[PDB]
Paper text:
These molecules were used to study the substrate recognition of the m6A MTase RlmJ, the Ribosomal RNA large subunit methyltransferase J that N6-methylates the adenine A2030 of the E. coli 23S rRNA. m6A RNA methyltransferases (MTases) catalyze the transfer of the methyl group from the cofactor S-adenosyl-L-methionine (SAM) to the N6-atom of adenines at specific positions in RNA, releasing the cofactor product S-adenosyl-l-homocysteine (SAH). Two crystal structures of RlmJ in complex with RNA–SAM conjugates were solved and revealed the RNA-specific recognition elements used by RlmJ to clamp the RNA substrate in its active site.
In the RlmJ/GA* structure, the ASAM moiety is superimposable with the RlmJ-bound conformation of SAH, Asub (corresponding to A2030 in the E. coli 23S rRNA) is bound in the presumed substrate binding site, and the neighbouring guanosine (corresponding to G2029 in the E. coli 23S rRNA) binds in a pocket on the surface of RlmJ next to the catalytic site. The N6-atom of Asub is positioned, through the alkyl chain of the linker, at 3.0 Å away from the carbon corresponding to the Cϵ-atom of the methionine moiety in the SAM cofactor. Such a distance, in two non-linked moieties, would allow for an SN2 methyl transfer to the N6-atom. Asub of GA* is involved in an intricate network of interactions with strictly conserved residues of RlmJ that reveals the RlmJ active site. Y167 also—along with residues V199, Y173 and P197—provides a hydrophobic surface near the catalytic pocket where the guanosine is positioned. Interestingly, H9 swaps conformation from solvent exposed in the RlmJ/CA structure, to buried in the RlmJ/GA* structure, from where it can π-stack with Asub.
Residue numbers in the entry: 2 to 53, 58 to 280
Write the structure that this text describes.
């Protein structure tokens, strides 16, 4: 009955990933046929901002009230505003609540979350929502057990914490088990850039699966470093919607200028593997 807190909720990485998620869902909704949203590392659902302040102040805060807000970011900010109708950031949606509000009545959610402290809160967020299934299990295995969805259209969101290095391996081995079973779905992998070499290994191991039509979006606050920590984050999208890349070239520059006012880092949208 008590919402979780999160120092990082709504930080620049969140803004990027929930932007890409929201754009992919809205592209899915263009056909009035149903689709699944599979979230492997779902977290609690929402996060009470502050204490009794937080990295949201340098993230969702810098963009959600901006008069010139790009039109592609509207569906995302409208979710944040639904969870903050006082006009003050006191809550930040998680990807499952992003999904809850954007998905239609006919659509389906599959959510997994192993930690005993969030699973209860998450389960309550869909307590009354039959579209979803919430389980306290390992989400990399839901790629083998939940796919393909009956609808045969969907978005898988793999957003691991990278607390153990083996998560840099797990996500690529998991995407291959997902892709064997459901090769037409859009997979979306978040990464933090702490040590680029780590990321470059991941990406090499991902093209080595042989999956094609792979895109890469990355928002860096600082040029790559080792003394700093998370100098960037990005999204690697497999089978993206065709407008995602022109949507992320139209948006990500603006995003970088608002989230990173001190003019450091970069904002890149590239193709890891062409079609
Ligand atoms: C950067 C990832 C932070 N978090 C999820 C954030 C949430 N999706 C959002 O979009 O706001 C990671 C959560 O994943 C849990 N977790 C860790 N390991 C697993 C596995 N193997 N399966 C499911 N869930 C996992 C953590 O407890 C975090 O709550």
């Amino acid at each position: 009955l008590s919402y979780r807190h999160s120092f990082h909720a709504g930080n620049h990485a969140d803004v990027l990933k929930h932007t890409v998620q929201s754009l992919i869902i809205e592209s899915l909704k263009e056909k009035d046929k149903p689709f699944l949203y599979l979230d492997t590392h779902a977290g609690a659902g929402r996060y009470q901002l502050g204490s009794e302040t937080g990295e949201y102040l340098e993230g969702i805060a810098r963009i959600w009230q901006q008069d010139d807000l790009p039109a592609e970011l509207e569906a995302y900010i409208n979710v944040v505003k639904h969870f903050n109708r006082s006009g003050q950031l006191r809550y930040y949606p998680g990807s499952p609540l992003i999904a809850r509000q954007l998905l239609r009545e006919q659509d389906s959610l599959q959510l997994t979350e192993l930690h005993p402290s969030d699973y209860p809160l998450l389960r309550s967020e869909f307590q009354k929502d039959s579209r979803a299934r919430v389980e306290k299990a390992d989400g990399f295995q839901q790629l083998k057990a939940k796919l393909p969805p009956v609808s045969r259209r969907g978005l898988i969101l793999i957003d691991p914490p990278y607390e153990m290095k083996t998560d840099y391996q797990a996500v690529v081995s998991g995407i291959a088990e997902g892709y064997k079973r459901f090769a037409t779905g859009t997979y979306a992998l978040w990464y933090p850039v702490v040590l680029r070499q780590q990321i470059k290994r991941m990406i090499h191991d991902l093209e080595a699966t042989g999956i094609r039509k792979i895109l890469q979006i990355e928002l860096a606050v600082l040029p790559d470093s080792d003394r700093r920590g998370m100098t960037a984050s990005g999204m690697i999208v497999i089978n993206p919607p065709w407008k995602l890349e022109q949507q992320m070239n139209n948006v990500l520059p603006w995003l970088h200028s608002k989230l990173v006012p001190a003019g450091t880092g970069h904002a890149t949208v590239s193709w890891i593997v062409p079609e």
